[PDB]
Amino acid sequence: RCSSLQAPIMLLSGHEGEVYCCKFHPNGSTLASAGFDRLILLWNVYGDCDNYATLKGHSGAVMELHYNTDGSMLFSASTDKTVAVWDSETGERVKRLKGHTSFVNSCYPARRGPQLVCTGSDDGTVKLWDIRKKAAIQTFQNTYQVLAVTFNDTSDQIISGGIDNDIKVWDLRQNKLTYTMRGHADSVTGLSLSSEGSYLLSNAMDNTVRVWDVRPFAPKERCVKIFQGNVHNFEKNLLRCSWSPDGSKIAAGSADRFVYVWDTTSRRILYKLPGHAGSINEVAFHPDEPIIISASSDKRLYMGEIQ
Amino acid sequence: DFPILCQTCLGENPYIRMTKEKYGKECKICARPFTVFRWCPGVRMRFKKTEVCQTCSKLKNVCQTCLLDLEYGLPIQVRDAGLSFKDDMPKSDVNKEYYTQNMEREISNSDGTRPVGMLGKATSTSDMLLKLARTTPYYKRNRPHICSFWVKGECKRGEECPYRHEKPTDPDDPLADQNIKDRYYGINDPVADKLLKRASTTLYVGGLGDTITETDLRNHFYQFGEIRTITVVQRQQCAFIQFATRQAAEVAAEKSFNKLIVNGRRLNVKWGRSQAA
Amino acid sequence: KVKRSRKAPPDGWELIEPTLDELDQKMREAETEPHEGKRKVESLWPIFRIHHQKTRYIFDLFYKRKAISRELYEYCIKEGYADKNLIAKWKKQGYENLCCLRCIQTRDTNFGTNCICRVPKSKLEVGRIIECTHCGCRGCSG
Amino acid sequence: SEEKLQEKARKWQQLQAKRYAEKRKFGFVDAQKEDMPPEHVRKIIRDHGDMTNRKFRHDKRVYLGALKYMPHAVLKLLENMPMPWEQ
């Protein structure tokens, strides 16, 4: 009906708790995943003889996980209320950053890589972090808890979203943010930005994917498209929306226990992938090969491939 | 691998905490060890349980706790006798019944719990059981558990302990709870009581409309007997079915009174005047 | 602390001896009386209630009135006069007023933990609150 | 929606705080075994245990398990040896 056939897939076991997030390295060789077990998951993935290994040292469950553009380092946000800097290929991590009053909501690297990484904490903290200086960048507070915070492609802007029920645009290098762009509604299922930088795709807790095209330069404050048809979160959940720039695609999780694939520019979605025993927490898309990482509450990562 | 657990004994709460039991008491019918699941539908209501095994629940095709008739939510006995005739051998020698049940379930490769629903074509007893069933009869189906200590005033705990005061009823007629629990399939029961209580030349029929035509009423009423004529009035959305013999007029008369559903639309049919008016 | 060990405790125990003697007399009187009132699991309530009363008396003497020396408090704790675990949970934020240690046992319950005696009356239903079967004890009026 | 922002901010603080209320990595520990009163369990159990009648009627099978386990009393009694060297 919707999905096309079945095709082979890879099931990744070993996660004690529900997987919080899933991501892949820029080279596509390894894929790391975070979960409630407070142990990062390194994976030899892109084809399977094996995954990679298990990473430890997190004092609490990792809320978010991401990899640096270089691939040798990665950042993670955990309930330990400390920014997690991890070196991986060296056998041990990077450094542990402190100063968060509450648990770290999300941590993502910027366009400068290890130089600065945008992060936020459920206390409502929106803060850039310098790393290689053995100290962060700067701290800021806007309204309320920011669910997701990520820097733009030019590293000069930082987009964030959370319980504040608004689209958060932040200017950074000016020691102040950018603008607050929101319609009339309150929902946050997550926040995301496209790779082109001309639009941002945020997840709405009403089960409504909101793609907004505004972009820098000429004033717009416009939108992109309204994606629907799949329920991302039933009541309250954190879903990481990762779009697939290959062709045109948008990947997201769902509370229906099915991976959510959405085509956008066609004014309709893509496909729904069943086979998950629980609600999908996060999904990823490999740039090199058409593979998608499936992280769900079932603690089993399902990586699909299109042939 | 849950039990039957129909919608009547589930309760109004969406979320329910149930505790399975691997080895429980033997089934009252199959007389074999099985799993015993316990849950409390109500806040202050007592926890439920299932005394029917997988073979006991599959043989009668009933809920593991309430043990109603099929999935229709009616009393077992009456609806079972209304299905065809009986089609059972509960009587005696469970050792001989263990071979028919073991070979039954072992030889049946098509079954399931709930990856399915409906998928039938009408029914003979769906109208009688549908008219004999209510909407979620969950009132006083779990908690009360009448206690004689509070009736005699000897209970020290009182309402703090379970079995709340003023629970019992007049020991005269069936107790509607433990009375059906005394036997299983044997008694006629309020199944049969409420079954008999549920059972109780021209014919006018209203509520036709544009969906119903004259050929449908002529073909439906023609099965009872020869029809003299039919008067189709579209302005009043009614039709008069005149039969030559009043026999079929009485059959289709009584059977056509608020029993008539044509193309999924109920029709109110009243007896013709025949008073020369 | 009625055992045969060689102690010679400080005079504080000699001053608090009548209280422990009365508690032991009430414990023996409660343990020597069966129940014909058709109650099985409810017969163990006054034992845990009296134990919590003695533990609350020792903890109230050492940690509030300050009328007992640290050596006497350690001799009473190591002598079996009071529960060290119940007093440990009483000193921290785990329990300010504790009924019994069995109510906090996670594995003792079929499904879940935290016997309803530990739930506040705010969220809990006052009609179905009644009393705990295991613990019971603390609280009277409603 | 300022009132909905403050109320939704408190409900969100109790929400994310409720998710962080676990404070256990892959689960937590269990209840540690504590010593019960000796006279309560000893005197009450052994007092009502040997009475049988309708009090121990449900305890019957439990006693069948007691007698059904030999090594408990053998290894317990043989394992308890105050010895003449002390008192």
Binding site: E235, A277, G278, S279 | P14, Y15, R17, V43 | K123 | -
Partner: peptide, 22 residues
């Protein structure tokens, strides 16, 4: 399977007789 923490809030809402389908 779902989360156990979410089932605790669902049971707490069930004891409060919360029928909200939102």
């Amino acid at each position: 399977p779902a989360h156990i923490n979410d089932f605790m809030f669902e049971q707490q809402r069930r004891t409060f007789a919360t029928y909200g389908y939102a």
